[PDB]
């Protein structure tokens, strides 16, 4: 997926790599996971990094992040990981992603985006026009393109 | 070409992209410390053209890059050759695509759009004065030297389809991205410098509306719309577009090659260079449609959020 892999690469790596040194230490992955309500231990972070650590330097390089993305997309059902992503986005469990929830998730990820960008994201994801994102609209945002 | 090893003089780094039979990687010259982009083109040199590039095409591309020296066009620095590849060490262009930079803007008038389009027109003018056709003008090949200045510097890259237009010889071929090719390309008709102007018209259409003029649901529909010159200025996408811009695009998207605007005529079109203050003020007040342009950008932002969340879920 040359175009999609390049886009997800450039974006996700830079979102994790908040200091910009070319690598991803366990601390950055830990901070990102803790901003998303998860609480992994240092041993678990090191085990995550070691399963793809090809050059054995302790951190995750660029192609190691690519191979980790590949193993993620290969070891799970697409629908199930999309469901879990939606459950992460939709916090109150009402079945609709509002603007507040989307903005909260984006800011927890480390994005400094204004309200206009959150509004345009919601609108681009909104198909029926109620102002929120259905689960179907979510998967159609994540479906084939 | 230099028969010496590339690794002997350049430190090879991250991969910047690729194409069909070529791969570009960032590199640094060891003797100077300056950074460049090494484009490895896999040699073929066998009659079975299924895998590899002919030596004729490589020599043509290298000759074109050597003859071209402009501030809006990429510059060839060196060429090496081993037993498998030919390596073109070129000027590093690391500012991304022009459209990727324009999308992340808050508002874009037609004046700044015409400034960028005029950088493109200066590049194409330098190319056409030497009777060199680019034949692969598309937003993927409109890069920025650096997105670190207010008005970035545009560079034209990827001369894999460039060809020398000689007087009195017929050059016909089928290549390029179908969305951006001229009617004489899809019809296998004699080619010239006019296809570059047609592609510039398509690029201006896309920059101004976010939609493509002849792009259909399938390749057949796209080719039929190109050969039939079938496009419109829909008010849903062209509500704010000025009349000068529409006249410019209309004068660029013509089937008959002799009636199509040349690069110099596009440089003198009032939309690029206004004649009076009235049309300059009109070009100031006209706003480009930045919503249909940022559509795909915000979609990929959605996908990035999804990828981060899914990677965090997959590990716990
Ligand atoms: Ca780091
Ligand atoms: Ca590593
Ligand atoms: Ca909700
Ligand atoms: Ca909805």
Of B14, B307, B313, Cβ closest to residue A8: B307
Q: Determine the straight-line distance between the first and last CA of chain A, rounded to whole angstroms.
A: 12
Domains observed in chain B: 6-92 (3.30.200.20), 93-316 (no CATH)
- Range list of H helices, A21-77: 26-35, 42-50, 62-74
Angstrom resolution of this structure: 3.0
Residue A131 gets the label, from left (phi > 0), alpha (psi -120 to 50) or beta, of: left
Task: Provide the 3-class DSSP secondary structure of residue B27.
Answer: strand
- Of the listed ligands, the closest to the CA of A123 is 4
Taking the centre of ligand 4 as the mean of its atom positions, its distance from the CA of residue B199, in whole angstroms, is 38
> Burial letters for B41-64: b for 16+ Cβ neighbours within 10 Å, e otherwise?
bebbeeeeeeebbeeebbebbbeb
Dist. CA B221–CA B120, nearest whole Å:
29
Cβ of A11 within 8 Å of Cβ of B304? The answer is yes
The coordinates were experimentally obtained by X-ray
Q: How far is CA A115 from the centre of its chain?
A: 20
Q: Distance from the CA of A6 to the center of ligand 2, in angstroms?
A: 19
Residues of chain B with C-beta less than 8 angstroms from the C-beta of A8: 303-304, 307
Phi, psi of B6 (to 5 degrees): -70, -45
Q: In the structure encoding, which two tokens stand for residue B125, read together?
A: 């003018």
A60, A49 Cβ separation under 8 angstroms? yes
Rounded-to-integer distance, Cα B225 and Cα B297, Å: 27
Beta strand B132-133 pairing with B163-164: antiparallel
Distance between CA atoms of B133 and A24, rounded to whole angstroms?
A: 45
Structural domain harbouring A47: 2-75
Alpha carbon of B96 to those of A19, B106, B185, B252: distances in Å?
21, 18, 28, 26
Q: Both tokens of residue B135? A: 């034949």
How far is residue B147's CA from residue B96's CA, in Å, rounded to a whole number? 8
CATH code of residue A11: 1.10.238.10
Q: Copy the structure tokens of residue B28.
A: 């640094």
Q: What residue spans of chain B are helical by DSSP H?
A: 55-67, 98-103, 110-129, 183-186, 194-209, 219-227, 235-238, 243-252, 263-267, 277-285, 291-314
The closest CB to that of A85, out of B17, B18, B309, belongs to B309
Instruction: Look up residue B217 and give its two tokens.
Output: 């649901």
């Amino acid at each position: 997926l040359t175009e999609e892999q390049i886009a997800e690469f450039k974006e996700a790596f830079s979102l994790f790599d908040k200091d910009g040194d070319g690598t991803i230490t366990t601390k950055e992955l830990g901070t990102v996971m803790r901003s998303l309500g998860q609480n992994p231990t240092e041993a678990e972070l090191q085990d995550m990094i070691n399963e793809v650590d090809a050059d054995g330097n302790g951190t995750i390089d660029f192609p190691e992040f690519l191979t980790m993305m590949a193993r993620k997309m290969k070891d799970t059902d697409s629908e199930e990981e999309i469901r879990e992503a939606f459950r992460v986005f939709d916090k109150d469990g009402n079945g609709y992603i509002s603007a507040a929830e989307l903005r909260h998730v984006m800011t927890n990820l480390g994005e400094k985006l204004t309200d206009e960008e959150v509004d345009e994201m919601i609108r681009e994801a909104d198909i029926d026009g109620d102002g929120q994102v259905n689960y179907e609209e979510f998967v159609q945002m994540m479906t084939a393109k | 070409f230099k028969q010496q090893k590339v690794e002997d003089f350049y430190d090879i780094g991250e991969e910047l992209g690729s194409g069909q039979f070529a791969i570009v990687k960032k590199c640094r010259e060891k003797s100077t410390g300056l950074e460049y982009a090494a484009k490895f083109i896999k040699k073929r040199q066998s009659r079975a053209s299924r895998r590899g590039v002919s030596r004729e095409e490589i020599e043509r591309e290298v000759s074109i890059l050597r003859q071209v020296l402009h501030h809006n066009v990429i510059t060839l620095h060196d060429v090496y050759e081993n037993r498998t590849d030919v390596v073109l060490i070129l000027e590093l262009v690391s500012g991304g695509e022009l459209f990727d930079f324009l999308a992340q803007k808050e508002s874009l008038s037609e004046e700044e759009a015409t400034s960028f389009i005029k950088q493109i027109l200066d590049g194409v003018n330098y190319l056409h004065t030497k009777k060199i056709a680019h034949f692969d003008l598309k937003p993927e090949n409109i890069m920025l030297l650096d997105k670190n200045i207010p008005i970035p510097h545009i560079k034209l890259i990827d001369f894999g389809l460039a060809h020398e237009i000689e007087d009195g010889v017929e050059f016909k071929n089928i290549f390029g991205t179908p969305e951006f090719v001229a009617p004489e390309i899809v019809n296998y008709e004699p080619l010239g410098l006019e296809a570059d102007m047609w592609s510039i018209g398509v690029i201006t259409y896309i920059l101004l509306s976010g939609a493509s003029p002849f792009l259909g649901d399938t390749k057949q529909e796209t080719l039929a719309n190109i050969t039939s010159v079938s496009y419109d200025f829909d008010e849903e996408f062209f509500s704010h577009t000025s009349e000068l811009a529409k006249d410019f695009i209309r004068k660029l998207l013509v089937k008959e090659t002799r009636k199509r605007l040349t690069i110099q005529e596009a440089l003198r079109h009032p939309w690029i260079t206004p004649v009076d203050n009235q049309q300059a003020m009109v070009r100031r007040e006209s706003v480009v449609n930045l919503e249909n342009f940022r559509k795909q950008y915000v979609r990929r932002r959605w996908k990035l959020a999804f990828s981060i969340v899914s990677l965090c879920n997959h590990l716990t």
